[PDB]
Amino acid sequence: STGSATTTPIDSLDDAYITPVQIGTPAQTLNLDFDTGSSDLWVFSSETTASEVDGQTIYTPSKSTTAKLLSGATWSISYGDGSSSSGDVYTDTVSVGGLTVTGQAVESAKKVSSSFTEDSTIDGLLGLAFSTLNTVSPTQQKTFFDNAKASLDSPVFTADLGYHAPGTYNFGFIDTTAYTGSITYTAVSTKQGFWEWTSTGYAVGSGTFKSTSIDGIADTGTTLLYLPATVVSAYWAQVSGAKSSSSVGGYVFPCSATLPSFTFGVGSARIVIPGDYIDFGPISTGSSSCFGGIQSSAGIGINIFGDVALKAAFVVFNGATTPTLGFASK
Template identity: 55%
Template sequence: MQPITFGSFLVTFLSASMAAGSAIPNAISTSGSFEIKRTENKGFTGRNGPLALARAYAKYGVPVSKTLTEAIELVKSTQLVKRGGSGNVTATPDGDDLQYLVPVEIGTPPQKLNLDFDTGSSDLWVFSSETDSSSSQGHDVYDPSKSTSSKKLDGATWNITYGDQSSSSGDVYTDVVTVGSLTVKTQAVESAQQVSAQFASGHNDGLVGLAFSSINTVTPTPQKTWFDNIVGSLDSPLFVADLRHETPGSYIFGAVPSAASNILYAPIDNSKGFWQFSTSSDIGGEFDAIADTGTTLILAGDDLAKAYYQKVQGARLDPVQGGYVFGCNTTLPDFKFTVGEGAITVPGSLVNYAPAGNGECFGGIQPSGGLPFTILGDIALKAAHVIFDSGKTQIGWAQKK
């Protein structure tokens, strides 16, 4: 992984004169709000639609079928890059289908890792010196023995198991974790000892969970998320996801940027630990939805996905690809969903996710596989500034122009 000093890492204070928020013992802040730019994942070589769908299914416990697994390998096999007369080399897609990551510093002196900010989970876990070398190859790792501030949390373990039985697990340390201008002095850092192939084949060095701490998987005592630890040092108890299409975008902590105007708000039901709210669509009725930066696609109820693609000429549910496909030159309709008293529009251009071969493309909206809620992943989040407001237990969406 490319270190921060050679990447596009940038922390921007939203206002140079902004006073620091009220401090809490575990956090050190140099600003009451800050913006952190995501960096390009240098290991990302292409989008794999079936892979993105399988990853989302696995995350939420939906069984990943043999057909979908075969579709992933089919896409990989067609992604061959020809370089003149030098032969063929395989361009293997990122196992986590993540094009942009966030640089994070852990330990004393700082160890730099590139992590995925995930509002659909609540664990901060990383590849580490304890991870089997065959699994950690190609990753930057956290080595607690090289940090003077690390302390093992005796008896604490963690285990994340997905619906396809892939998993990651290990032990837990507390250490200094810095993102942007704010440091948590004793953040729980979950050190991976066992990592499934799903994660090992990816290029991110771990995850920063930004859902609610109630679903943290550390036992016997769940740990607070990084955000919950720093929230008292922010000017406002919120963060904003400003994700963008084919450019890194950023996360803003402690303030709502001026570019976010005409914000629509909806109350959050956090009883399951997610950023979940009630919404509706004119093509699918009312339903619950989760805003998840750690999922690429929109996973909609089967009827809602079917209703959307009924509006797309030639679209079909392809058993070989494991999802809906359509002609790549097709102009897709917008997808709209309500937030409070208004609605957000996801441009059809964002729904055209990835080439699927033979002139067809894989859709960014796919069936949820029976989940009791819709997942609004990056396809939807890129259409708006999304405000995750823990102070008022609400979520805001501000349409991008």
Template identity: 55%
Template sequence: MQPSFGSFLVTVLSASMAAGSVIPSTNANPGSFEIKRSANKAFTGRNGPLALARTYAKYGVEVPKTLVDAIQLVKSIQLAKRDSATVTATPDHDDIEYLVPVKIGTPPQTLNLDFDTGSSDLWVFSSDVDPTSSQGHDIYTPSKSTSSKKLEGASWNITYGDRSSSSGDVYHDIVSVGNLTVKSQAVESARNVSAQFTQGNNDGLVGLAFSSINTVKPTPQKTWYDNIVGSLDSPVFVADLRHDTPGSYHFGSIPSEASKAFYAPIDNSKGFWQFSTSSNISGQFNAVADTGTTLLLASDDLVKAYYAKVQGARVNVFLGGYVFNCTTQLPDFTFTVGEGNITVPGTLINYSEAGNGQCFGGIQPSGGLPFAIFGDIALKAAYVIFDSGNKQVGWAQKK
């Protein structure tokens, strides 16, 4: 993922996969493993407008000022609830509350990172960031790692649709996730960060999209997954995201619970896990499976058709998206994967409280993007298989 723009770190940049990237050394025959996400203790509750703005920024859609204002409005509502002596605010557990511990360097420095299938950079807060900007974050200190080696002449610079940015240097270092170690992984070490990044509670992310959209210049680097995939029993990983519990990622094998998945071929020409689908309220369209996005974003027509089934649902211009009465029971959302169907329960689509008895929907307009974004609202309904070997995605409905 990640409660700020810092959770969604990479705007899509056009980059070609360059030859000559360092070939990493990995430990022998790790086979497959599962890594569980851990709770982010700094989580303070869901903010619907913020989740929507993050995704717009990530994919280069201009963030309207009204949406920026709405973020602060919802934050003020949440603060008022926490300060009240008569109303108790119990933050919902959510995808943005969970992170993955990752060890970097020798001796290992542990940072809590978000796994993001919608980007391709391993980005971290570092000791080069001004201490006032990195406060509250665990940081990577290259000088304290005996295995760290600076990649001279390499840099990265991420810019969002709202013109916030982050940039820095690149190191090669040991990176361990679970029981698997890559001995020469590109680690993008932040030097400058915008305020939106510093407000997050995660320490960076691990991009799991395709290496073709890695942002390092002059030579794009391989993702951590691309570096270890040859050592796995099978070239796959599975996202098992959960509601009200951390969930996990499986690398190198498919858990038995996901054995009855439906599959669809992917188009990775833009670097994403993109597949063709259709829904029970719309025709054929393309969608990107993105663990680094919270909401489900789709075309205006599809979103309008969905909320036409919800009595009293409307676009709230102050909150920047569709809202409805919190007592309303939302309909399910069903979409196709290959020859099968996956259903997102309506309970998952009621994303967050927005004040005055209104709730913010987990399905929102995509801002004119040429594809839908199936974020965690959709992903939590299924085991999602990212199969790079067969260039396909699989979805297995959760019961």
């Protein structure tokens, strides 16, 4: 089997991407944030505290003929941005892009934090990291990918995120028309439950490539590119007037600037992030200070290749017995 679904930016900045997902029978279509940095499929639901729902589409387990309580199971998750959610668990049929899994754990939110409530465009998350991170207790559950894997034509999924445009998530096949050149594969460590890999270095604009190992995660659920402070300082030093602002919470730059590109290494290959991808626009409405898309990881504990980096590439998440990542230009 295979599946193929279009993923669409939630706003003009590409802050996140939503992908329609069919849950239940008859289908209830929710727009979920596919997150390769977490492992829970959770949704706004009829159980979600009413004051915490503001415009989201909800999943109603009772209105689904295939919805079965996973008795005793609870979940609770906290993300890198300080957001959180928790609740109970139903198994139900879940389809993505024509690919169906029966008996998928659908984690129904009883509570969500303010950042979820305030974003009407995201109806929940679909985690695509390794199932060792799933938060369901007392019986950990599998991700949609892990449940689909044995049925897929190839044990893979691909992320092809757009810059200010829709893109695609494919399951079970690598679409050889979607990228240019060849795909460079690189080793993955699953020790922390993430798609963790080591970049071979970076360049800023037209500058020389710096060969250096940067260990980080491929995380579709993180907007920005978070790298070591040395790397980030080297980038923003090439933008006149850029500075780190503790008041704003990262590097800002004059909205009048033209940003340099940023290159990262994948083995001997190179992915170039155009300068425009690194613009996240005014810090507040009408400001002439703009927020940077490359930020320091120093206050995180991990480097994160988020959407700023991933949307410059066609990315293969190879879930074979020994997982690997692949990157191609596009």
